[PDB]
Design a protein around this nucleic acid. Structure first.
Lengths: 65, 88, 65, 100, 116, 271
RNA sequence: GCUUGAGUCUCGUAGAGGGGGGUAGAAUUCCAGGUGUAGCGGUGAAAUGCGUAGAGAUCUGGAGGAAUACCGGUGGCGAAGGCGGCCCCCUGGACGAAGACUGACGCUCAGGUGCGAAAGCGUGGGGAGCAAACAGGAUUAGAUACCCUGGUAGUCCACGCCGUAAACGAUGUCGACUUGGAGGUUGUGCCCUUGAGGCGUGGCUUCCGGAGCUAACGCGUUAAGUCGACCGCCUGGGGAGUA
């Protein structure tokens, strides 16, 4: 039910990991849009950002590294 | 992929002015330039069937446009085919 | 995945395991791929889920309870 | 001529050399009529997972606007440099100079 | 016996059996006990009680090592996965922290077709 | 390219010729040529030591610069040449000082590419570098066993080795046979695979085609006599014996490796 | 001649669309070593199998092939088959805004051409896991099946061949009209973004349903309703989609 940049418009960035940690659980898994309430347009962009932060070792793939 | 500066040359060369972008002479030449540019893309990789159908669409689109121009005015049709180098 | 309950635990309280799967993905890839039944069992999953929602907005009968 | 966003990690033993690659790579871009937009060095920060050896590597953000033939040869210099670890290049998206 | 201070207790709770192995912090095993080694052959091997008695028979033969606090590594679904750690807490040990070490693949190798 | 021949006559129906158009059709570089007399399997004692050798077309040897010791001077490839003495093609390169040499032609090479050797050469196919200056995991060929030996591994057409590991002064390689081998890091190697990878797709077609390769007909042991071959004999195709060599050594599986001095450099045998 | 058909340009939007090349993580398998001990594995149960040559378990290091958990959603794209980790290059298709231009250039299409799941075939590689064939152990009166332990082809790659599917919303393509509601996805206009918005206008799509249709089930503005153009197909069942 919560909202995100669908209202406070900004482009999804893969570097500001402070906001990206709110959309991943403690295991590093991507939280679905059915829980956070984000739109599908930015959820797809968020998914690329999480995968990109995982590649650059800014966010963990999991906690079993 | 037929960028804006490439399209701006053809409309100013084949059309009456810079606004005559829809004429048959422009449309055939516009499609021909994309076909010849896509020849090098299909010179390689031998397997891009999805884009090849897109190439085959504008091949038939040029054929339909050329046959209309041939039926409409032969003088403009004969002038266009020698200008582009086609119609075996 | 990780749980501490630092000093005053005296019990597991390990609901963080079942908070993500703890059984769900490991009892799904231990067999039965088919490459097919994930399509069929998911088409009928939301087909019955929307009819439980269709009767959730169509239960307005008296029913004398 | 397209925008880009180059991010590369360097080995911590060459983190005293992390300024040294900056003038070598930007002059290769500006030598090919490429415009530089950012020199955002994040420093040596914690890694999320150990990459091929011990953690705590050094990050550099470039975010350049350069033609094609200079980006791919810069990528090959990242390949044959043992200090460079896991480089990547992004889309154009009208390269920005923000988001520290 | 070496008189070790701490250690790690790995639990391999498979579908048919539960393997409880107590190692040190460096992964060197100090002793183990399984549900199928504690009697219980057949259908009684895959039950939470057999996993519970596997920890009780793993509570001894270590201890000589003198372990006071330990970490629990839970792996596999298991018929137990909760009784084997409840008995470990009541065996005279200090359960510091618990993490899940289940080898969950990210769509890697192909699963079998068995058990139709 | 690979070309299938038409069945105009017997001995031609089953012929596939590997014709390669960019090979220079003229005479080769005369200063790099010298005679190469046929031996026919005979030795100083004049007895045949290696059977099924004799005849064949006359071929002159070409001096191929295997060592690649010209360091710091770039070389431009002039033309591709056909080498009858080897399975691969050879590239005639022209150095900047006017010296011409024959090298083993890599996979990706044309007439006009610039190559150089030494230690300061870049990572390019055709460039020769010591293996502590070549990245681990890259594919190299013309591999030396000793510092300055010349290059003895992966010289056939299409063959190559892979740099698997580099620990200290020794570099572990994956040989083309599938054998892990350790060599000195001071040795040089040429980057890339060897050209003419279509060699093994060539079918001879006829008996004669093997006859002018230098290969003589091979006689089966079963067709022989007991005085000639250990198999011999047979009143109506009788074998009844374990397959062996004509000198009694067992074949079809028998490890003949007995060296005891190069085994330290071998990590894993082939499978 | 003209513009509502069709088409082109200008500025943007979304997408697993296609091809080529690299790269990341988890997991499985294998090898070597360390710790460590009698079972491990499997089943309704058991055995084949593995293990005192020291297995299973745990840790470290290394080598390989395949596929991308979460995101992930009757979500999206593609004519169809089908396509999902990330990144570089090439490139196709679709949609929206308000303008500009050609001026019926349109629709369908026998023959013909191209694409075309998986299995399979030819050549050269690769092979981790899975797995026809096959072996052994179980069940059974019998079990050359379902069960278990293994395991070849194949599944993977490069180029060709094959052109076959319950290739199915079982509904051909194009065009016009005809109550509606509830949603998803993707543009865009106006008003106050005055506050997770309000009022409209387009493309795709899901469900329920009015009239109408149908033998009924059911379809129902993406119709199986009301009309036009064209192609293909059927004339009881078996024989047989066989010779």
């Amino acid at each position: 039910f919560c909202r995100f940049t669908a209202e406070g418009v900004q482009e999804i960035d893969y570097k500001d990991i402070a906001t990206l940690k709110n959309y991943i659980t403690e295991s590093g898994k991507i939280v679905p849009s059915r829980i956070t309430g984000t739109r599908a347009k930015y959820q797809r962009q968020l998914a690329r950002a999480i995968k990109r932060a995982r590649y650059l070792s800014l966010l963990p793939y999991t906690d079993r590294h | 992929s037929l960028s804006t500066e490439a399209t701006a040359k053809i409309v100013s060369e084949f059309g009456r002015d810079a606004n005559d972008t829809g004429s048959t002479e422009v449309q055939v030449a516009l499609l021909t330039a994309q076909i010849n540019h896509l020849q090098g893309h299909f010179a390689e990789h031998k397997k891009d069937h999805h884009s090849r159908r897109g190439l085959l669409r504008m091949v038939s689109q040029r054929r339909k446009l050329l046959d209309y121009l041939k039926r409409k005015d032969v003088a403009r049709y004969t002038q266009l085919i020698e200008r582009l180098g086609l119609r075996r | 995945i990780k749980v501490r309950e630092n000093e005053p635990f005296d019990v597991a309280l390990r609901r963080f395991k079942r908070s993500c799967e703890k059984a769900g993905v490991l009892a799904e890839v231990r067999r039965r791929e088919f490459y097919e039944k994930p399509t069929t069992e998911r088409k009928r999953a939301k087909a019955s889920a929307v009819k439980r929602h269709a009767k959730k907005l169509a239960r307005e009968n008296a029913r004398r309870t | 001529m397209r925008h880009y966003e180059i991010v590369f990690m360097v080995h911590p033993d060459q983190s005293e050399q992390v300024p040294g690659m900056i003038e070598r790579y930007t002059a290769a871009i500006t030598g090919a009529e490429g415009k530089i937009h950012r020199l955002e060095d994040w420093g040596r920060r914690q890694l999320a997972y150990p990459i091929n050896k011990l953690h705590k590597a050094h990050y550099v953000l470039m975010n350049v606007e350069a033609p094609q033939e200079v980006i791919d040869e810069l990528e090959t210099t990242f390949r044959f440099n043992d200090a460079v670890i896991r480089s990547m290049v992004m889309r154009t998206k009208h390269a920005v100079t923000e988001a520290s | 016996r070496k008189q070790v201070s701490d250690g790690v207790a790995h639990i391999h709770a498979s579908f048919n059996n539960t393997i409880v192995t107590i190692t040190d912090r460096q992964g060197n095993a100090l002793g183990w006990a399984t549900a199928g080694g504690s009697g219980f052959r057949g259908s009684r091997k895959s039950t939470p009680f057999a996993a519970q008695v596997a920890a009780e028979r793993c509570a001894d033969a270590v201890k000589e090592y003198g372990i006071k606090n330990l970490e629990v590594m839970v792996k596999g679904p298991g018929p137990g996965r909760e009784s084997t750690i409840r008995a470990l807490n009541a065996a005279g040990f200090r359960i510091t922290n618990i993490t899940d070490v289940t080898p969950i693949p990210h769509n890697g190798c192909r699963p079998p077709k068995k058990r139709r | 390219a690979v070309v299938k021949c038409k069945p105009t006559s017997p001995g031609r129906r089953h012929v596939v010729k590997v014709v390669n158009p960019e090979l220079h059709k003229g005479k080769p570089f005369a200063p790099l040529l010298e005679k190469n007399s046929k031996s026919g399997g005979r030795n100083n004692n004049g007895r045949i030591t290696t059977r099924h050798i004799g005849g064949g077309h006359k071929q002159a040897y070409r001096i191929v610069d295997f060592k690649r010791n010209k360091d710091g001077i770039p070389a431009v490839v002039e033309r591709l040449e056909y080498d009858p003495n080897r399975s691969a093609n050879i590239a005639l390169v022209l150095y900047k000082d006017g010296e011409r040499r024959y090298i083993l032609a890599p996979k990706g090479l044309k007439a006009g590419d610039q190559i150089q050797s030494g230690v300061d050469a870049a990572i390019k196919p055709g460039n020769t570098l010591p293996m502590r200056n070549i990245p681990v995991g890259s594919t190299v060929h013309n591999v030396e066993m000793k510092p300055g030996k010349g290059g003895q591994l992966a010289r056939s057409a299409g063959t190559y080795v892979q740099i698997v590991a580099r620990d200290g002064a020794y570099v572990t390689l994956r040989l083309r046979s599938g054998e892990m081998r350790k060599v000195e890091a001071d040795c040089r190697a040429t980057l890339g695979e060897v050209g003419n990878a279509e060699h093994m797709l060539r079918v001879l077609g006829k008996a004669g085609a093997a006859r002018w390769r230098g290969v003589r007909p091979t006689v089966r042991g079963t067709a022989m006599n007991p005085v000639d071959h250990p198999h011999g004999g047979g009143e109506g195709r009788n074998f009844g014996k374990h397959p062996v060599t004509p000198w009694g050594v067992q074949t079809k599986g028998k490890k003949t490796r007995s060296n005891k001095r190069t085994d330290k450099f071998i990590v894993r045998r082939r499978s």
